[PDB]
């Protein structure tokens, strides 16, 4: 299963904490700026899509809903989380690093 996080925020210190558990998770984590840096991404992933999971923990409900929508128009397999804290970015990481990504798809009727 490959298991890929991306992150969307601009505190410098949330991004390393949360890059830091997925380098020691061994989990291919990426720092995304915009929805043109959200959606290279997601196009990166559609070429290997075979047992894919990504996280992308966002700093805003603005990004939350954005990247939501992105991994949906993709059908790219995704859990968008919110996070106002790194050691919640952190915890994500490591819940999805242990389950491999449990279902999570409480809503898919879009």
Do not use: C
Request: charged share 40%; glycine share 2%; aromatic share 4%.
């Amino acid at each position: 299963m490959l298991l890929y996080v991306l992150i969307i925020s601009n505190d410098k210190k949330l991004i390393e904490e949360a890059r830091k558990m997925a380098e020691k998770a061994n989990l291919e984590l990426r720092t995304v700026k915009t929805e043109d840096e959200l959606k290279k991404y997601l196009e990166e992933f559609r070429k290997e899509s075979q047992n894919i999971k990504v996280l992308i923990l966002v700093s805003n409900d603005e990004e939350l809903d954005k990247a939501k929508e992105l991994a949906q128009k993709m059908e790219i397999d995704v859990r968008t989380r919110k996070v106002t804290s790194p050691d919640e970015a952190k915890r994500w990481i490591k819940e999805f690093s242990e389950e491999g990504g449990s279902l999570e798809h409480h809503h898919h009727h879009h």
